[PDB]
């Protein structure tokens, strides 16, 4: 969990 993933 990096809070930057392309979802």
């Amino acid at each position, epitope marked *: *969990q990096d*809070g930057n993933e392309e*979802m």
Partner: antibody
Amino acid sequence: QSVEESEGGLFKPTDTLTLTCTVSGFSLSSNAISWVRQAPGKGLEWIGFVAVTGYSYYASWAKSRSTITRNTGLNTVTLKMTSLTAADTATYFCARIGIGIDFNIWGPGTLVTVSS
Amino acid sequence: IDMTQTPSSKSVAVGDTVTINCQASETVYKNNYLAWYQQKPGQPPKRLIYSVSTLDSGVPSRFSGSGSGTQFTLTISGVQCDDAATYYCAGYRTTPIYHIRFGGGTEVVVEG
């Protein structure tokens, strides 16, 4: 590598909580740091985190009162929570939470009591 | 997302097998961003399993994890007194907003 929460303690209702998480032995710039709290005898509750980008995201219940900020030069992540009530009494943890990644590290927690 | 853990408590005898279920209300990230933590009183939670089934370093092999998407299971095969603790699943979801969610916990009492 380790993380450590600054001192909590006793707060009056309507006070603002400010906790610091200090990071050692790993790079804050590329690691997302969460704040998680646990009321006495209850379960873990994610508050929010600062992403590897430096921008923060929050649980919907926490968004209006909570600010999570990082200072990469000081190796710190700060949790500010306004408008405290007894419901905010808990142990507060900071953590690099590894749910789908190898790196995972949790602090020892600090006790926050909100009471008159 | 909601994370529903069942059962919320269980008493088990030494040597038994314990099964804990975690149901997410939507799929976790990449269908496998799901981890299991073990917490004893006064301690931070200790990660046991991440990415559904990967054992953390030094975790005994009697712990195994399975599942995908929204349904996950933690199995303790041959439970020991050292395993008496509360267990939490933890999932990650990126949409509509990045967030982590813990299950409500399962308190495991071990009968010696």
